[PDB]
Symmetry: C2
């Protein structure tokens, strides 16, 4: 059928009302990341937060289809930046690959976070803005997670 | 002083070779090394290709002033004769200067092969690329073309 690739980039910017060390721990700590990112529950979740390390989040939807997120960290600067690449498969079908940059900056009060994703959608997978929308929601969950551990 | 600059570039070429041959120039370690790793007055230090999803490629070369240019890639998706997707990092010494997601797509044309190379890159911490990666990639893809030409079978 359609073997094809569609590329796009999106950027999300948030001011977080938490100190950067706490914000970063929400990304680097397996229990924390599983909570705000993966539970909103996975069949498999693992996080090895090191350059070269991997993250997995495998979850089945209500009708049995396995959604498999696999990431590999490329660059981690403590309390400053996280760069990783990830792929999403549904069943055995790869639907996308992305390079993600998350940058953190101290402000006189909170933390500014800029999330940039450079993604390719594969073989006619119909994104139609859903990845951006889902990431906005995911980042809303990170914010609630930070608020509730205050 | 930490920072990140994002960009995407696309190179499209029409290659005067059949797609099977074009794809083997990417999939075959000895072939890839010839057009990707063989330049020039620099010191080749390491080349390796493990061409499969999850596999890695390394190309480490020292420039004439002794700076190690270290290319490390990891394949994400490979569709035989059709598409290669990989992510890579470039380090100079131990300093990471960039990370990229590359998509290479191959299409059969009435005559030859259409190749579309798309790179989504982030340049790190003020590394001043200023279009140099695009220009270097254009030159590298020119070397692929010469490789293919010289591998051609006679009439």
């Amino acid at each position: 059928t359609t073997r094809s690739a569609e590329h796009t980039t999106f950027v999300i910017e948030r001011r977080l009302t938490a100190p950067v060390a706490r914000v970063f721990r929400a990304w680097s700590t397996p229990e924390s990341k599983r909570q705000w990112f993966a539970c909103h529950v996975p069949l498999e979740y693992a996080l090895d937060f090191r350059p070269g390390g991997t993250e997995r989040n495998y979850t089945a939807d209500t009708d049995g289809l396995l959604h498999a997120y696999d990431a590999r960290y490329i660059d981690i600067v403590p309390d400053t930046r996280i760069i990783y690449a990830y792929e999403m498969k549904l069943g055995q079908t790869r639907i996308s690959a992305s390079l993600v940059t998350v940058a953190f900056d101290v402000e006189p009060s909170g933390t500014r976070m800029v999330f940039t994703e450079q993604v390719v959608f594969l073989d006619g997978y119909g994104d139609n803005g859903a990845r951006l929308q889902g990431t906005e929601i995911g980042l809303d969950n990170l914010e609630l997670f930070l608020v509730r551990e205050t």
